[PDB]
């Protein structure tokens, strides 16, 4: 139970413990930063970054969402995605580019 | 209130939009506009009167 506690980024500090998914999810707030030119600069925006981390013998993902997003909704969505990834780690994904349709007419009958 | 109420990020209050194209039969005068709602600001269409 709870294997890795490394905090790869020093600028972000943990705010909740590594709650487990019945993977583990950890919420990290950000420490103080430099001055901003104006207060309407931190939460301004909608793009979300999903940063990938090197595999630690487990994989770590840094997902950052804008402020206005509800933390409960973000946590639930991330938990559902983690459960789906754990279950699935197919031909359906292969169908959606490198399988072709007309070339899939010699093999089925010949 | 002194915070989280106004932007102070150099944005305009009034905007003049000129039509991208106009066609006028001798019964009707049609004007087509495309209004860009900033990136973060919002407006209510109670404004935006045709001049």
């Amino acid at each position: 139970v709870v294997l890795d506690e490394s905090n790869p980024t020093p600028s972000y500090k943990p705010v909740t413990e590594q709650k487990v998914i019945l993977p583990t999810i950890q919420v990290l707030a950000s420490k103080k930063r430099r001055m901003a030119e104006n207060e309407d600069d931190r939460g301004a925006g909608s793009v979300a970054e999903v940063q990938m981390r090197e595999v630690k013998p487990i994989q770590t993902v840094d997902v950052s969402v804008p402020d206005h997003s509800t933390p409960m909704e973000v946590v639930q969505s991330l938990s559902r995605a983690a459960q789906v990834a754990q279950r699935l780690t197919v031909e359906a994904m292969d169908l959606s580019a490198p399988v072709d349709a007309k070339p899939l007419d010699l093999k089925p009958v010949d | 209130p002194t915070h989280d109420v106004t932007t102070e990020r150099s944005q305009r209050l009034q905007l003049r939009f000129v039509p991208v194209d106009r066609e006028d039969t001798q019964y009707s005068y049609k004007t087509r506009f495309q209004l860009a709602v900033g990136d973060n600001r919002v407006l209510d269409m109670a404004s935006t009167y045709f001049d």
Partner: peptide, 20 residues
């Protein structure tokens, strides 16, 4: 965000106007 914008310090929502 911080509990929405502040109010001027010292039915709310919805309209039902009809009939004609």
């Amino acid at each position: 965000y911080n509990y929405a914008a502040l109010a001027p310090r010292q039915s709310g929502i919805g309209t039902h106007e009809m009939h004609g």
